[PDB]
Design a protein around this ligand. Sequence first.
Ligand SMILES: [Mg+2]
Ligand SMILES: [Mg+2]
Ligand SMILES: [Mg+2]
Ligand SMILES: [Mg+2]
Ligand SMILES: [Mg+2]
Ligand SMILES: [Mg+2]
Ligand SMILES: [Mg+2]
Ligand SMILES: [Mg+2]
Ligand SMILES: [Mg+2]
Ligand SMILES: [Mg+2]
Ligand SMILES: [Mg+2]
Ligand SMILES: [Mg+2]
Ligand SMILES: [Mg+2]
Ligand SMILES: [Mg+2]
Ligand SMILES: [Mg+2]
Ligand SMILES: [Mg+2]
Ligand SMILES: [Mg+2]
Ligand SMILES: [Mg+2]
Ligand SMILES: [Mg+2]
Ligand SMILES: [Mg+2]
Ligand SMILES: [Mg+2]
Ligand SMILES: [Mg+2]
Ligand SMILES: [Mg+2]
Ligand SMILES: [Mg+2]
Ligand SMILES: [Mg+2]
Ligand SMILES: [Mg+2]
Ligand SMILES: [Mg+2]
Ligand SMILES: [Mg+2]
Ligand SMILES: [Mg+2]
Ligand SMILES: [Mg+2]
Ligand SMILES: [Mg+2]
Ligand SMILES: [Mg+2]
Ligand SMILES: [Mg+2]
Ligand SMILES: [Mg+2]
Lengths: 114, 56, 209, 120, 122, 5
Amino acid sequence: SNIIKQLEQEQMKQDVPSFRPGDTVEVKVWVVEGSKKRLQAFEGVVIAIRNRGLHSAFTVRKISNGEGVERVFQTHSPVVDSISVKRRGAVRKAKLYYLRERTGKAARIKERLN
Amino acid sequence: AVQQNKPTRSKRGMRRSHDALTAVTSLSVDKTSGEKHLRHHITADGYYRGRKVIAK
Amino acid sequence: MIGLVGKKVGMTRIFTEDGVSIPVTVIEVEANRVTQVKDLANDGYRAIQVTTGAKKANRVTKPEAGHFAKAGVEAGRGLWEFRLAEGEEFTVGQSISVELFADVKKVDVTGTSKGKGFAGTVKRWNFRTQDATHGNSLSHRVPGSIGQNQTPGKVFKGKKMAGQMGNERVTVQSLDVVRVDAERNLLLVKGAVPGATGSDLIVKPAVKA
Amino acid sequence: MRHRKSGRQLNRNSSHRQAMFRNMAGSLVRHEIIKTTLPKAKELRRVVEPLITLAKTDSVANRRLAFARTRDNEIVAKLFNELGPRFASRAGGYTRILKCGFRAGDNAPMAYIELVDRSE
Amino acid sequence: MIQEQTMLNVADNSGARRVMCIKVLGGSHRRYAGVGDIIKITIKEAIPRGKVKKGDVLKAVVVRTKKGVRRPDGSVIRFDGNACVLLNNNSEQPIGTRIFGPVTRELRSEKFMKIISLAPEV
Amino acid sequence: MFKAF
RNA sequence: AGGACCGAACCGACUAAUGUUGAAAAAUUAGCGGAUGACUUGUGGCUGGGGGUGAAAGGCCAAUCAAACCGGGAGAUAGCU
RNA sequence: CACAGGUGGUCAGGUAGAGAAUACCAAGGCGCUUGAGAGAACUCGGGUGAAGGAACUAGGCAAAAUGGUGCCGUAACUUC
RNA sequence: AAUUCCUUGUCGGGUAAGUUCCGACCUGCACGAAUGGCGUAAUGAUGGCCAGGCUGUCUCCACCCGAGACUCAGUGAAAUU
RNA sequence: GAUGUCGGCUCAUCACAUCCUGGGGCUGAAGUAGGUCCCAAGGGUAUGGCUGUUCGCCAUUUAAAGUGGUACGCGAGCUGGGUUUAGAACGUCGUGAGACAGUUCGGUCCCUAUCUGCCGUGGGCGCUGGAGAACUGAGGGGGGCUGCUCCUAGUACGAGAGGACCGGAGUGGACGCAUCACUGGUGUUCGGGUUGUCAUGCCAAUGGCACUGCCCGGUAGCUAAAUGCGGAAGAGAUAAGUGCUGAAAGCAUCUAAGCACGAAACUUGCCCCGAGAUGAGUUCUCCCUGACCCUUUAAGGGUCCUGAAGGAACGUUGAAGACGACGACGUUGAUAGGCCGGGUGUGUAAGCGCAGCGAUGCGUUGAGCUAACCGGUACUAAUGAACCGUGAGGCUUAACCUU
Ligand SMILES: [Mg+2]
Ligand SMILES: [Mg+2]
Ligand SMILES: [Mg+2]
Ligand SMILES: [Mg+2]
Ligand SMILES: [Mg+2]
Ligand SMILES: [Mg+2]
Ligand SMILES: [Mg+2]
Ligand SMILES: [Mg+2]
Ligand SMILES: [Mg+2]
Ligand SMILES: [Mg+2]
Ligand SMILES: [Mg+2]
Ligand SMILES: [Mg+2]
Ligand SMILES: [Mg+2]
Ligand SMILES: [Mg+2]
Ligand SMILES: [Mg+2]
Ligand SMILES: [Mg+2]
Ligand SMILES: [Mg+2]
Ligand SMILES: [Mg+2]
Ligand SMILES: [Mg+2]
Ligand SMILES: [Mg+2]
Ligand SMILES: [Mg+2]
Ligand SMILES: [Mg+2]
Ligand SMILES: [Mg+2]
Ligand SMILES: [Mg+2]
Ligand SMILES: [Mg+2]
Ligand SMILES: [Mg+2]
Ligand SMILES: [Mg+2]
Ligand SMILES: [Mg+2]
Ligand SMILES: [Mg+2]
Ligand SMILES: [Mg+2]
Ligand SMILES: [Mg+2]
Ligand SMILES: [Mg+2]
Ligand SMILES: [Mg+2]
Ligand SMILES: [Mg+2]
């Protein structure tokens, strides 16, 4: 699969930062409003990350206007511009799917002060 | 579920035409010990490919 | 129009500046050496016999190697034929590469499907499964009735039944050509194609047009 | 379907299958040569050989890991004291399978499995 | 994936709390209604003194689903619950005057520009 | 088993 | 105190599946009812066929019951096959 | 029948537990008299499941679910 | 109505839609007072109906773990004809 | 001396007196939308509430929710709710035993497939020397549905309301095919958390059992809900039908001679099987160039020499597979395992120190472990051979190469 590796390698984003499950991440995504392009910020807690090279993706959960929302971002897609870690959280599990059943105080994540 | 007529000897024989066994095509000879054996199997005295694989 | 024989390297994702992701099957098309030309005067039809790849010299039968020697070509994986229309001609030993598809918008891909072995009617023919409860006795996913009593007194030919599924030639039509990379002998086609990774693959111009 | 899957079930559940190879693996370490059915010998390769690789480097953590996979201190001592040093230079392939006909009781195919350095 | 017998929350102030889908319009044997699809619904719970009452048969457009919405780049947007906006049966126009919760871009059509304008997010 | 009346 | 309550042994047999040339001529598996009482159980005894016994289903009376089983009248009779 | 049935008493260990339930063990006794491979349909006994949640069906059949201690609290109807 | 033929009677409730269910009407084919009438707390492996929870019951099946099925060695049936 | 019922489920197949889609004639057909008749069977031709129901009514959809035959198709395929055993009760009839196309509650659905048929998959032989490949395509099968929006055009039409045909574009429903790149499911062969108990002497650390003990995540593979594609244009001959020229019949007349158009039907076009197509085809390569002996002297038998092409067998095995089969490889070798490196998944191992009375926390440390995956590596196993298969391939005639 060296052919696939070269094809995927040539189009992998290079400025991807380092982030982990449980850290609050803000992602800038291109949104097209007619002819004019625009950027909107989606900020939330990273509850799941899959690393597959070009096919890597991560899931961000946020509560917006009283409704829970989950977005699965393709990290290397051109749609996403930059990733910023506003806060670093310490968790014991790779996947935080249990957060879906909690809200408010029960959903708090302790900060990772390494 | 069960037959309506007794099948004949002929039908019985034809069904058994494919039940015949096949003999081993040939038997390999150990390079040094000299006993005939199945290919890729050790000989009676434990030899294989000219080396005494098994002590017994 | 003449096609080419390639190998299913795998599947990949191609990103576009507009933000759209195109799933592309990567097909490697090495040099296609023509081994024989079929003529009306001798064979009754116009076609070209081609071979691709290489195979170990210890396993090329001189009946096959002699065929390659006749055309002065190195033995390939196998032999395939393509029909010739009125306007195209070729010479024995000519090497054809992936640029032939550089001017082709759509291609036709054929290959052997993945073998599912002995498949039941539910999997093979999308038969509806019967009740899993409510008294059903050993007939949860059985085919059911297969006839209409005495009047026909038989099962009609072509009745859908359990049997071998897959492992057969299949053609997928009207696949967009995303990109042609003649510097690495690769062809990218949108969508999936029959067969597993590394299987022989035949690519032809879209007949449907 | 069985596409690209590995590991023979051998008509046993996971618990029984795991236990059998733990005992058989210890037997091969204790006795440099054993007799068993051909399919079992092939499956055993994926159990005993990794243990020998673990014994290549001697450490408290590795010994405890070996103990968890054999549950026999005598085998663990054999792995790290004798087998490890002997196979220090070999890059895998610490076991060899030899076919020895068929079992009289049920005609099962039998094959000897042994360490490659049994020569003495 | 919205079918018959599925319960949906109401994302508008028409007065209904949760409605019951009774038909997936737009085809024969059609069984699924994603975001932006119109469905026939019956109101099950509603607030008093609202402009709609329990037992009314209307149609609504799905604005949020647990199964989520797929984007061209492969990204998927999921919501914690299914929601819909009630529409007038004859004119297929929104009945409520305010939308609750985030809305998805797939309803960016001339027939649903009213919902997008009134939506709080995107 | 069966009956016919 | 209780023909009281929950629940094992014990005695029952409501549902489902399996089995239906069964492991079994009535069972197994998972649930289920009673479980100090009109309870259950060991040993022995008594009631005999137009009779017994029956909280009553024509149930049961040795895998047999709108009249048990065995022998006899008997080679009943059969305008039927 | 070397049959997944039936058959009355006596003895009653350890940890957890209200317990002779249940789990793992002691003493003690066993692995049930065809095996070896393969890992198709289908059947049997089980595990998990995206979104929906009785739309199944004669019928929520079957499955899933509830499940223990204390403490708070508990309606109509009651022969109290 | 365990009783009603006509009959899915008529009206109301429940459902988006109810030959069933609940309430009422009385035109009771063919209720009725110890072969008992009408009520009735509690009880029921009892009949009908509804709701919450719950789910592969289903939309629509997918995967997996075991015992058969399949192959090899040994033993070796049956109904039927 | 036995042909098992209503309905449901599953799976269907045919007819055309056609429900939708297609082509037309009339219309009391302005348009839109209808009415009626003709041709057309290629495809398609609802989910629910009540009831055992078919049916029917009702709710809401659809381009339409066609009518029938097939033992009122289909119980050695399922179900057993209804009828139609034994129990019991109501009303009713009878003095009574009992009885009721009256109503109520409860109530055993057996069969391991011999043959035909059908769905798959092999063996044998044949195709006239043998062998390895690629093909021609006689034949056969699969596929054939359709909505909505936009443009043409608010144009034709109409007083207005309303509102096109004919042609284009886009996006859907259902169905079918393929595949795992993505989103997910599963993942009892990968990590981790945790309850009870037992054991490894003990602490520590681990293992067994308890549905995988209960759980949280998960690689490969499989897979749909996931995402790619498909139905067609085009051609030929036509149905109903509309026409050209044109007589029989000075006219007329689509017809008798001669021409043209005409539909999802038909033959092709697209996809798949296919020379057992015994009518057994074609093309391109490869292999064999010896002695004799007998009489029943002929497509004769037999001995010696010879054993080619190739195949089979065995072994390592496969995203091939029930078994056969099929594909890869066998040292002149990456076929499988292991090994090395990497990637995934889990989430900071063990040991030791540092803080705390302690549970525990922190440091070493994104550590340790890591299945099927990726790129490599002969460390292990794929043996030197034997086995099968031969030695120039009938006759007649013809056309050539000839003497
Ligand atoms: Mg396969
Ligand atoms: Mg049964
Ligand atoms: Mg079953
Ligand atoms: Mg016939
Ligand atoms: Mg077995
Ligand atoms: Mg276990
Ligand atoms: Mg009591
Ligand atoms: Mg009790
Ligand atoms: Mg029981
Ligand atoms: Mg009686
Ligand atoms: Mg008896
Ligand atoms: Mg007499
Ligand atoms: Mg007599
Ligand atoms: Mg026994
Ligand atoms: Mg116990
Ligand atoms: Mg299995
Ligand atoms: Mg689910
Ligand atoms: Mg239904
Ligand atoms: Mg139940
Ligand atoms: Mg349960
Ligand atoms: Mg009433
Ligand atoms: Mg009375
Ligand atoms: Mg009682
Ligand atoms: Mg056998
Ligand atoms: Mg008869
Ligand atoms: Mg046609
Ligand atoms: Mg209906
Ligand atoms: Mg209901
Ligand atoms: Mg019938
Ligand atoms: Mg039936
Ligand atoms: Mg039948
Ligand atoms: Mg019944
Ligand atoms: Mg009568
Ligand atoms: Mg300890």
